[PDB]
Design an enzyme around this catalytic site. Structure first.
Site, PDB file in Angstrom:
ATOM      1  N   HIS A  49      23.328 -21.093  97.068  1.00 25.80           N
ATOM      2  CA  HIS A  49      22.943 -21.202  96.259  1.00 25.80           C
ATOM      3  C   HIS A  49      22.995 -23.026  95.885  1.00 25.80           C
ATOM      4  O   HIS A  49      22.849 -23.548  95.469  1.00 25.80           O
ATOM      5  CB  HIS A  49      22.741 -20.892  95.084  1.00 25.80           C
ATOM      6  N   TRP A 188      22.463  -4.158 103.279  1.00 28.88           N
ATOM      7  CA  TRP A 188      21.546  -4.287 104.164  1.00 28.88           C
ATOM      8  C   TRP A 188      22.062  -3.793 105.305  1.00 28.88           C
ATOM      9  O   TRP A 188      21.100  -3.218 106.379  1.00 28.88           O
ATOM     10  CB  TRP A 188      21.934  -6.301 104.577  1.00 28.88           C
TER      11      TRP A 188
HETATM   12  C1  HEM Z   1      13.950 -16.540 101.615  1.00 27.53           C
HETATM   13  C2  HEM Z   1      15.548 -16.417 101.579  1.00 27.53           C
HETATM   14  C3  HEM Z   1      16.262 -16.008 100.795  1.00 27.53           C
HETATM   15  C4  HEM Z   1      15.638 -14.414 100.057  1.00 27.53           C
HETATM   16  C5  HEM Z   1      14.743 -14.646  99.126  1.00 27.53           C
HETATM   17  C6  HEM Z   1      17.938 -14.084  99.422  1.00 27.53           C
HETATM   18  C7  HEM Z   1      17.948 -13.339  97.986  1.00 27.53           C
HETATM   19  C8  HEM Z   1      19.106 -12.332  97.875  1.00 27.53           C
HETATM   20  C9  HEM Z   1      18.606 -11.246  97.044  1.00 27.53           C
HETATM   21  C10 HEM Z   1      17.473 -10.989  96.333  1.00 27.53           C
HETATM   22  C11 HEM Z   1      19.575 -11.225  97.292  1.00 27.53           C
HETATM   23  C12 HEM Z   1      20.558 -10.838  96.054  1.00 27.53           C
HETATM   24  C13 HEM Z   1      21.366 -10.828  94.361  1.00 27.53           C
HETATM   25  C14 HEM Z   1      22.196  -9.671  93.779  1.00 27.53           C
HETATM   26  O1  HEM Z   1      21.297  -8.987  93.141  1.00 27.53           O
HETATM   27  O2  HEM Z   1      23.349  -9.704  93.788  1.00 27.53           O
HETATM   28  C15 HEM Z   1      21.221 -12.289  97.626  1.00 27.53           C
HETATM   29  C16 HEM Z   1      22.010 -11.789  98.044  1.00 27.53           C
HETATM   30  C17 HEM Z   1      23.122 -12.843  99.274  1.00 27.53           C
HETATM   31  N1  HEM Z   1      22.741 -13.548  99.868  1.00 27.53           N
HETATM   32 FE1  HEM Z   1      20.720 -13.909 100.424  1.00 27.53          FE
HETATM   33  N2  HEM Z   1      18.368 -14.337 100.090  1.00 27.53           N
HETATM   34  C18 HEM Z   1      17.824 -15.722 100.550  1.00 27.53           C
HETATM   35  C19 HEM Z   1      18.812 -16.300 101.765  1.00 27.53           C
HETATM   36  C20 HEM Z   1      20.134 -16.520 101.972  1.00 27.53           C
HETATM   37  C21 HEM Z   1      20.825 -17.349 102.997  1.00 27.53           C
HETATM   38  C22 HEM Z   1      20.742 -18.334 103.261  1.00 27.53           C
HETATM   39  C23 HEM Z   1      22.934 -17.200 102.474  1.00 27.53           C
HETATM   40  C24 HEM Z   1      23.172 -17.465 103.440  1.00 27.53           C
HETATM   41  C25 HEM Z   1      23.635 -18.239 104.285  1.00 27.53           C
HETATM   42  C26 HEM Z   1      21.943 -15.468 101.739  1.00 27.53           C
HETATM   43  C27 HEM Z   1      22.977 -15.392 101.658  1.00 27.53           C
HETATM   44  C28 HEM Z   1      23.477 -13.813 100.342  1.00 27.53           C
HETATM   45  C29 HEM Z   1      24.692 -13.229 100.486  1.00 27.53           C
HETATM   46  C30 HEM Z   1      26.202 -13.094 100.785  1.00 27.53           C
HETATM   47  C31 HEM Z   1      24.414 -12.032  99.813  1.00 27.53           C
HETATM   48  C32 HEM Z   1      25.369 -11.247  98.877  1.00 27.53           C
HETATM   49  C33 HEM Z   1      25.680 -11.630  97.739  1.00 27.53           C
HETATM   50  C34 HEM Z   1      26.834 -10.693  96.998  1.00 27.53           C
HETATM   51  O3  HEM Z   1      26.550  -9.210  97.600  1.00 27.53           O
HETATM   52  O4  HEM Z   1      26.688 -10.261  95.623  1.00 27.53           O
HETATM   53  N3  HEM Z   1      21.063 -15.640 101.956  1.00 27.53           N
HETATM   54  N4  HEM Z   1      20.068 -12.954  98.569  1.00 27.53           N
END
Ligand code: HEM
Length: 291
Positions: A49, A188
């Site tokens: 982010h 996931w």
């Molecule tokens: C269209 C793009 C993407 C969408 C809409 C998206 C959306 C989300 C959402 C909604 C979450 C859950 C947030 C939560 O409730 O804590 C999440 C978490 C996460 N995202 Fe994505 N994301 C996207 C792309 C990416 C990419 C590019 C990365 C990194 C290379 C990434 C890394 C992850 C990681 C590792 C989590 C887990 C974080 C944790 O467990 O707290 N995301 N994302």
């Protein structure tokens, strides 16, 4: 608007390896976090982010300025919960006050991937802290309830193509969604503090059922207890995205190489490196060092 990488004065490879090791030792130590997932996932989520705000049209946002430290960006709704990774990194910044904030946030991501057994990610120093009025406005980070068209268009703001988009999304093998953060709930896959090609395998191999969650948002749920966001599910709806999904399900080494290049690119967007800048660093893991 040009940001020129400027190496922290008199620091070299071994200085940053130390910063790596402190992050990695703390990752080891704080294993209980988020029901024993650890801080790995949230660290790569933070690095994505702080980099994801970039706009290739005018070079606003991006990791260079370290602007996530200002309240307008850390209060961004798209960033809810990321304050936990920032808090994790506070003791580290204290121990190494000479590193810049963007360098530290980005390095935390690299460190997380490598210690979670993912690929080596080359990393470059030289981001420089910029003032509060360089903080980008909220709303630059992507929505989850959209389709592949949206996703394709979004990532073009980051100069990413189809392959890069699908590699990058593979990071959703890590961690989980949290209802209170994002309005989505669940992981996931099963091995969510180990970097593997599981996201692609689950996407193709599970029995997905479209449902409404307790926040009334639609998500794809499997009998296995896994979930997919609509943007995730997009990747097997678009035929171009689906072909690459199959590729990575079938070849984790290919996925690791493409993720590696794409993740470095994401964290370096907006940064201009001098011809004489040092070569990208490749940090040793704790295991590789006997620590
Ligand atoms: C269209 C793009 C993407 C969408 C809409 C998206 C959306 C989300 C959402 C909604 C979450 C859950 C947030 C939560 O409730 O804590 C999440 C978490 C996460 N995202 Fe994505 N994301 C996207 C792309 C990416 C990419 C590019 C990365 C990194 C290379 C990434 C890394 C992850 C990681 C590792 C989590 C887990 C974080 C944790 O467990 O707290 N995301 N994302």
């Amino acid at each position: 608007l040009v940001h020129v990488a400027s190496v922290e004065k008199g620091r070299s490879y071994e200085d940053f390896q130390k910063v790596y090791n402190a992050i990695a030792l703390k990752l080891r130590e704080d294993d209980e976090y988020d029901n024993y997932i650890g801080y790995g996932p949230v660290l790569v989520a933070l690095a994505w982010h702080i980099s994801g705000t970039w706009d290739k049209h005018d070079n606003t946002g991006g990791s260079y300025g370290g602007t996530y430290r200002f309240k307008k960006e850390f209060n961004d709704p798209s960033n809810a919960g990321l304050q936990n990774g920032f808090k994790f990194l506070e003791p580290i910044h204290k121990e190494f006050p000479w590193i810049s904030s963007g360098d530290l946030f980005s390095l935390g991501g690299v460190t997380a991937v490598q210690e979670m057994q993912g690929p080596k990610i080359p990393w470059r120093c030289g981001r420089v802290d910029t003032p509060e009025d360089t903080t980008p406005d909220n709303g630059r980070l992507p929505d989850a309830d959209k389709d592949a068209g949206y996703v394709r268009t979004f990532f073009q703001r980051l100069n990413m193509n189809d392959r890069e988009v699908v590699a990058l999304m593979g990071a959703h093998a890590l961690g989980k969604t949290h209802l209170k953060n994002s309005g989505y709930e669940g992981p996931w896959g099963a091995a969510n503090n180990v970097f593997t090609n599981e996201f692609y395998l689950n996407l193709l191999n599970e029995d997905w059922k479209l449902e409404k969650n307790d926040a009334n948002n639609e998500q794809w749920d499997s009998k296995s207890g896994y979930m997919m966001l609509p943007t995730d599910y997009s990747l097997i709806q678009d035929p171009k995205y689906l072909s690459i999904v199959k590729e990575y399900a079938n070849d984790q080494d290919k996925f690791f190489k493409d993720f590696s290049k794409a993740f470095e690119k994401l964290l370096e967007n907006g940064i201009t490196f001098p011809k004489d800048a040092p070569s990208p660093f490749i940090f040793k893991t704790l295991e590789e060092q006997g620590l």
